[PDB]
Design a protein around this motif. Structure first.
Motif, mmCIF file in Angstrom:
data_model
loop_
_atom_site.group_PDB
_atom_site.id
_atom_site.type_symbol
_atom_site.label_atom_id
_atom_site.label_comp_id
_atom_site.label_asym_id
_atom_site.label_seq_id
_atom_site.Cartn_x
_atom_site.Cartn_y
_atom_site.Cartn_z
ATOM 1 N N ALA A 143 -54.311 35.495 44.214
ATOM 2 C CA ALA A 143 -55.011 36.205 45.297
ATOM 3 C C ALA A 143 -55.820 35.228 46.137
ATOM 4 O O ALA A 143 -56.680 34.505 45.623
ATOM 5 N N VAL A 144 -55.517 35.195 47.431
ATOM 6 C CA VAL A 144 -56.199 34.315 48.365
ATOM 7 C C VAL A 144 -56.658 35.147 49.559
ATOM 8 O O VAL A 144 -55.850 35.829 50.198
ATOM 9 N N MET A 145 -57.958 35.096 49.850
ATOM 10 C CA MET A 145 -58.531 35.846 50.961
ATOM 11 C C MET A 145 -59.391 34.926 51.820
ATOM 12 O O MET A 145 -59.967 33.953 51.314
ATOM 13 N N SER A 146 -59.463 35.211 53.118
ATOM 14 C CA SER A 146 -60.272 34.378 54.002
ATOM 15 C C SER A 146 -60.752 35.103 55.245
ATOM 16 O O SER A 146 -60.105 36.025 55.717
ATOM 17 N N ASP A 147 -61.900 34.679 55.760
ATOM 18 C CA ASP A 147 -62.319 35.075 57.101
ATOM 19 C C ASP A 147 -62.968 33.897 57.811
ATOM 20 O O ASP A 147 -63.206 32.854 57.200
ATOM 21 N N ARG A 148 -63.220 34.057 59.106
ATOM 22 C CA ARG A 148 -63.801 32.992 59.926
ATOM 23 C C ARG A 148 -64.882 33.579 60.839
ATOM 24 O O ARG A 148 -64.813 33.460 62.067
ATOM 25 N N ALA A 149 -65.879 34.214 60.223
ATOM 26 C CA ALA A 149 -66.968 34.879 60.947
ATOM 27 C C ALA A 149 -67.600 34.006 62.027
ATOM 28 O O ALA A 149 -68.089 34.523 63.037
ATOM 29 N N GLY A 150 -67.586 32.690 61.810
ATOM 30 C CA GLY A 150 -68.183 31.732 62.738
ATOM 31 C C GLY A 150 -67.570 31.707 64.131
ATOM 32 O O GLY A 150 -68.196 31.220 65.072
ATOM 33 N N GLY A 151 -66.349 32.223 64.261
ATOM 34 C CA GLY A 151 -65.682 32.336 65.561
ATOM 35 C C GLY A 151 -65.799 33.699 66.230
ATOM 36 O O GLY A 151 -65.259 33.909 67.320
ATOM 37 N N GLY A 152 -66.481 34.634 65.576
ATOM 38 C CA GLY A 152 -66.648 35.979 66.124
ATOM 39 C C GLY A 152 -65.405 36.826 65.930
ATOM 40 O O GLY A 152 -64.470 36.429 65.216
ATOM 41 N N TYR A 153 -65.404 37.991 66.576
ATOM 42 C CA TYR A 153 -64.317 38.965 66.505
ATOM 43 C C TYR A 153 -62.949 38.361 66.828
ATOM 44 O O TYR A 153 -61.943 38.714 66.203
ATOM 45 N N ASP A 154 -62.914 37.452 67.798
ATOM 46 C CA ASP A 154 -61.639 36.919 68.283
ATOM 47 C C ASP A 154 -61.182 35.630 67.585
ATOM 48 O O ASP A 154 -60.172 35.035 67.978
ATOM 49 N N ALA A 155 -61.915 35.205 66.554
ATOM 50 C CA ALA A 155 -61.492 34.069 65.732
ATOM 51 C C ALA A 155 -60.046 34.276 65.258
ATOM 52 O O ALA A 155 -59.701 35.340 64.757
#
Ligand SMILES: *C(=O)[C@@H](NC(=O)/C(=N\OC)c1ccco1)[C@@H]1NC(C(=O)O)=C(COC(N)=O)CS1
Length: 261
Positions: A230-242
């Motif tokens: 299981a691998v999950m990720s986000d990039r909150a630092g770029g905002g909604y449009d990251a």
């Protein structure tokens, strides 16, 4: 050291990365932010199909479901093609897993039934598998940090383990789920990219706003030893449009594969 490698990838992709691989006979569990929450995105569709399979006789797959214009509210590569004829439950399961079809998932949720258009019954299914962590709250078509519609790498891995490798489902229903995940069309650049060609990979992807990219897989070594990844990720630092970054997941999987081979 895996934790340094994972941290390195986080800096490369300006991302938050979560990884869980359950322990086996001879490998310890691999874990990085494994108990932190990440949006499900489309990864819930695998256990969703398991819920629908479990809930009904296998011939329920042949029940035709009709739907119209206002049911197409999200990315739905298959359901948009068949709106004029309807789709069987089996066809909807196929679409939900293999094409991550949004409408198909919503219709399956509606088939499972109950409050919140099926989200409560879906969550109930996870609870029945000992998952007290995950929650589905809304349909297709969530700010970073928000707990709604989230799981953890740890929780979703243990769910997938039961569905594919354990006895959550009888063998006949288990094989339907496993086959659909085997024939997935959306996962070539994620966990699949990180494991050598002689390893079997089955998976369900998830992609969202705020640079969200997930993949949950079961993999088999050249000698048939299974592992849940299981691998999950986000990039909150770029905002909604990251932009979601598949390469982050490919690299994380490569690091995992290096430990497991
Ligand atoms: C499920 O993850 C779902 N994605 C969406 O419905 C998204 N937006 O609606 C809120 C979304 C954002 C970015 C892309 O889609 C579907 N699943 C998947 C998936 O990977 O499983 C995709 C994937 O696109 C790829 N492969 O890059 C889009 S629709």
């Amino acid at each position: 050291d895996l934790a340094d490698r994972f941290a390195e990838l986080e800096r490369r992709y300006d991302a938050r990365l979560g990884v869980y691989v359950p322990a086996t006979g001879t490998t310890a569990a691999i874990e990085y932010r494994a108990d932190e929450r990440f949006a499900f995105c489309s990864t819930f569709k695998a256990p969703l199909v398991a819920a629908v399979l479990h809930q009904n006789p296998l011939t329920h797959l042949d029940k035709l479901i009709t739907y119209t214009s206002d049911d197409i509210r999200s990315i739905s590569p298959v359901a948009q093609q068949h709106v004029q004829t309807g789709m069987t439950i089996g066809q909807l399961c196929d679409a939900a897993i293999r094409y991550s079809d949004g409408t198909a998932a919503n219709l399956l949720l509606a088939d499972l039934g109950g409050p919140g258009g099926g989200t409560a019954a879906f969550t109930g299914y996870l609870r029945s598998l000992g998952d007290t962590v995950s929650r589905l709250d809304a349909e297709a078509p969530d700010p970073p940090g928000d707990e709604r519609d989230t799981t953890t790498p740890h929780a979703i891995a243990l769910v997938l383990q039961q569905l594919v490798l354990g006895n959550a489902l009888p063998p006949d229903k288990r094989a339907l789920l496993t086959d659909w995940m085997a024939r997935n069309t959306t996962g070539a650049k994620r966990i699949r990219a990180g494991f050598p060609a002689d390893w079997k990979v089955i998976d369900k992807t998830g992609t969202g706003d705020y640079g969200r990219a997930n993949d949950i897989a079961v993999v088999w070594s050249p000698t048939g030893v299974p592992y849940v990844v299981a691998v999950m990720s986000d990039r909150a630092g770029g905002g909604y449009d990251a932009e979601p970054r598949e390469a982050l997941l490919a690299e994380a999987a490569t690091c995992v594969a290096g430990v497991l081979a």
